[model samples]
Target: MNIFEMLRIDEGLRLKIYKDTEGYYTIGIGHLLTKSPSLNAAKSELDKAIGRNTNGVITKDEAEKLFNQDVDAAVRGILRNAKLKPVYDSLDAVRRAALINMVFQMGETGVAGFTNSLRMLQQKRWDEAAVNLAKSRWYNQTPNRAKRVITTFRTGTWDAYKGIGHLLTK
Candidate 1:
């Protein structure tokens, strides 16, 4: 069964698909991100409700809040029918989550547009996959976040946790 079916959305959550300043697609699980309401206020509300529902964890709620919703459905549709699922599923859940998050951020349709890159990832070609990942339109979009996620996929561990760049050099 689809994970979305497991989480029922009754009320207190209105789903939205937002285009960030950079024009990337963002799945808004609850509330809108805008001027009058304020991002902090919006996120705070979402956090409180989602936190209560998921028992204090934020990320899972974020994902759950998106489950089965339109934006989430669109993402899953592309991933499910795309050539990438087999390869995508081969990775660890965290790695898959990071990749899916990127795909979610950059519409799965856009990610699928990267034919050769997607193929490389499916083939288990590490170097090629890293190159493909770096070549994304998302690479410099969220600079640090994108780099860390891709690096995690490339190295199989968190860089900071592995002691890289944790301290300054003389």
Candidate 2:
């Protein structure tokens, strides 16, 4: 499936359009989750970012089509877009993917602000990244939502919780 389709740009979700322009924007489901300008725009942005980050090797064209392209593909795309090259030794696909989703939502620059979390991940500290991931502003504001994504990252399985788990549970 296409990236937009994988992200599920449904009607209920709020999308913002530039009042004077033709771009559309909305937040997607992840910690790397960021405010997308539009499905196409988001893809373009990711493509450009990947190109710059990868020195013109990995293009958006190579990855954009993979989101929800399959669950694994979606995670991989998320990581790739964040410039997190596949460092299988230090980070597992799920952890990397979860963080990438967070980066996608928060923007690579903004998400990179999590210095300690990145450090933990660099040291193969999965639990640390997961904990730091839960304690973020994104997690605090959207605790349940963040937690579910984190769970998916840690366990590589989807959880159905939306707005209740983190806020209501311990």
Candidate 3:
């Protein structure tokens, strides 16, 4: 019904902080702790939000609320990129979510740098778009995530691949 609900279904709600597909400490609908300073700040905030005794644990409701608060800004931030607008707008909900997920993992500028992928997407060349997605440093860095994104584009479905979480522990 709501975007938050859709995103929660797609991204999954994790109550405990764990390393995500890209090995970032993530919780509450893919909130990544990428920078040290931000990680410290988020920990402080989380402590206050859920209380110190819980040991960084947040409830599903709390996570959903946090996701609702955070999702809009992220979506708007990605949509602000003019270069990505056309292709982004042309996509269906699942494909659009995939693009937004990529933007969330990498930054908007980083996603924009995938010119070939964007071009292929704009042209509706699904297979080519998948190939372009695969042929990237992002793919090399997070192959499983890359495969999921490519699969989403190629299939137009939000079938998530449960990647090897072990690699993230190392």
Candidate 4:
């Protein structure tokens, strides 16, 4: 499959700047940033591509384009963490997507810090893994999305919560 499609499966499509795992301002498909120049650059790019300012929202098409530009780097970052490789490779598609989603939100380093959760995943202890995921600071911060991830990890399905609005927006 293409890179664009791969990222769509992993990052989901977002139109606005939500706080990422490290609390950086992010938009589109995981475009993390701390300040203006890079943020302004993304704005300029979006404005050029979709006729909207950075302050404005993105369309799915525009978000896909942005993800195409950014996702390869994210994959590279994920692969660099040797400890996660075997578990990541062994997981089924849904579980892999869950891990990729975590990587997108938290970055590889941040996700790697979940030692207990990672160990549970490695052991194929689905219930314990779900519980570990639920007990995290990430779960506390984004309960709805985290619940979905935990469910997916436990059940290997993509039945995540997609409600009226995202937790960050609410």
Candidate 5:
């Protein structure tokens, strides 16, 4: 699915500290380096990434590493979610990538809240699934990203990924 490339572009690799939309300290590929109490398992890793920051500075290599970890975390979170797991497993790689992108963009809980969309996806109702997903605040907030994901789900193809590659670690 080339998730790394896909997410690197979507999240925008940043080697320096940055504040996300909600004002959380974020780095790398949207890795919440500090102040997210909900994450205990990645506490050590997050600390390491933060420690390396040394006042808003790190390397592209290190940023890429953190990105990989964050991506893995997104995948794990989706697989662990009972409501998403079955549907996630039923999807092809492209659709699965789309789901991961959603989870990575808006935490697992946010994506899980789309009960209608999840059921539509599970039933392979591609058209309705896209509609269900598009009919949300997410679609309004990040229309471009949402459209790419919805297109993937509706087509089960990577056509939308064309030219969607960029990594800003440098």
Candidate 6:
């Protein structure tokens, strides 16, 4: 599976509007309808869509479209952060993906909260960076996902998450 597909497993897919762990309205592949541009589109996509559509359910295509857009946003958001830019550029695709996954889950600003962690990452101190990641409240929010992402930083492989299809399917 591709990086986004791997993320799709991490996030899970839903074709209907639902509340996320944060209690915000979300849809598709972890698409937080409450978030910025998502808010802009949700207003129309939820209430009105392609040819003035109705109902709470969206097609798989629409969901995938939104998923790709969110990934793009996450990618740019990671690059946009001054502190993360150089570090992001230094890593290989796999390691960079760990950052993108982080940004995808929490905005780049949210990922920016990891001060010492970023420093360690910038220094290529993998295990130290991984330790710092474990020190975060995010680890408390989603331990399994957080653990795997940390291992990605430590070992620079998608192996922690198995680099495959959906969660249960594997």
Q: Kindly list the per-residue Cα lDDT of model 3 for residues 19-100, writing each as its tens digit.
A: 6665556677766544344555556656664546446688887776666656665577667889888888998887887777
lDDT, candidate 4, at 96: 80
Q: Arrange candidates, best TM-score first.
A: 6, 5, 3, 4, 1, 2
Worst 10 contiguous positions by lDDT, candidate 5:
161-170
1-170, model 6: which lDDT tens digit per residue?
46786688788888886666665667778876653335445555565432445366788988887778778888887778898888899888888988888888877778788888988998999988888899877888788888888888899887887711111000
Against the reference, the lDDT scores of all candidates come to 0.47, 0.43, 0.67, 0.64, 0.74, 0.74
Which candidate number maximizes TM-score?
6
Shift of residue 91 alpha carbon in model 2, Å: 2.7
Task: For residue 13, give model 2's deviation from the true position in Å.
Answer: 5.0
Any runs in candidate 2 off by more than 4 Å, and if so which? 1-83, 86-89, 159-170
Better of 1 and 2 by lDDT: 1
Q: Supply the TM-score for candidate 5.
A: 0.83
In model 3, where do residues sit more than 4 Å from their true spots? 1-12, 21-23, 37-41, 45-55, 158-170
TM-score result, candidate 4: 0.69
Superposed Cα deviation of residue 106, candidate 1 (Å)? 1.1
Q: What lDDT tens digits, residue by residue, belong to model 2 across residues 1-170?
A: 22243233211122221111112222222112124434555444434533443321333343333232334543454456443443333565555545545543444555657777676667766666689777877778656557766665556544422231110000
Q: 51-86 in candidate 1: lDDT tens per residue?
A: 444222346446454443534554475568556676
- Per lDDT, what order, best first? 5, 6, 3, 4, 1, 2
Model 5: per-residue Cα lDDT over 11-58, one tens digit each: 776776665655556767777655543334234444565564255667
Q: Comparing 5 and 6 by TM-score, which wins? A: 6
The alpha-carbon lDDT assigned to residue 59 of candidate 5 equals 76
Candidate number with the higher lDDT (2 or 3): 3
